[PDB]
Amino acid sequence: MPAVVADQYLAMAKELAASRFGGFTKENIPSPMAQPESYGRDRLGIAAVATENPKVTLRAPFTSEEFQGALYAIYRHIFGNTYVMESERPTTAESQL
């Protein structure tokens, strides 16, 4: 029997079905609701504050970078997201910290 389709299209079909486990079955179809795992936090814009930014923890001994990053996170949370100027920065409180 002569070929019914060109080999390029057979290759395309084979490699489309190769990227599925089981190829194309009724049981293994993608969900019509095409939601990624990060759909909700991405559409809400809360991905950064809810999952991505780590919880900043500071213990009794620490290096310089740990201290400075802790201070940045603290000022960006406690003072809202408002710009705190250098004249407003509390020095004695962080010396005690």
């Binding site: 486990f21 089981g22 795992e37 990060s38 991505e52 780590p54 970078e65 996170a73 960006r76």
Partner: protein, 162 residues
């Protein structure tokens, strides 16, 4: 997801600072690792079907009681779900290899895994055995650096199952 580039960017951002030399060297390391990781992803994608069917048979061999009726692995639907699950695991391992991070595995598999396993009484030893077969086979499908990358991610999944 939590990959090298994304960790770099997020750690720098939460500290309100640009990307420094260390962060760029991490990115450079990721870009160098891309070659063996993507070649391993190619190898595991190409051989996905024999891998998954052999893994299901390995599970049934180490856990013979499962196929008997009245328990989890009896029936075509249950075994089809088994193959689907191991296909999911392999898929997300390939995603991790491509992304050069445990991000896809953590977001899509590791998070909430234990609660789901308890809810449906799916024994983690099943999946550990399937991943062990995948490990043995990728020992024979890959070599050198790609082998090490694939093994890293497979062991990550196994360690997070146990």
């Amino acid at each position: 997801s939590r990959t090298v580039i994304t960790e770099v960017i997020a750690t720098a951002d939460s500290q309100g600072r640009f990307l420094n030399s260390t962060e760029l060297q991490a990115a450079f390391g990721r870009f160098e690792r891309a070659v063996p990781a993507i070649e391993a992803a190619r190898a595991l994608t190409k051989n996905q079907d024999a891998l998954v069917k052999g893994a299901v048979q390995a599970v049934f061999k180490k856990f013979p009681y499962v196929t008997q009726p009245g328990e989890k692995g009896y029936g075509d639907s249950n075994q089809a779900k088994c193959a689907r699950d191991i296909g999911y695991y392999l898929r997300f391992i390939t995603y991790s290899l491509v992304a050069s991070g445990t991000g896809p595995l953590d977001d899509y598999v590791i998070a909430g895994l234990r609660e789901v396993n308890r809810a449906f009484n799916l024994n983690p030893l099943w999946y550990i055995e399937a991943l062990n077969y995948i490990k043995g086979e990728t020992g024979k499908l890959l070599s050198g650096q790609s082998k090490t990358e694939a093994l890293l991610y497979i062991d990550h999944a196994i360690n997070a199952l146990s």
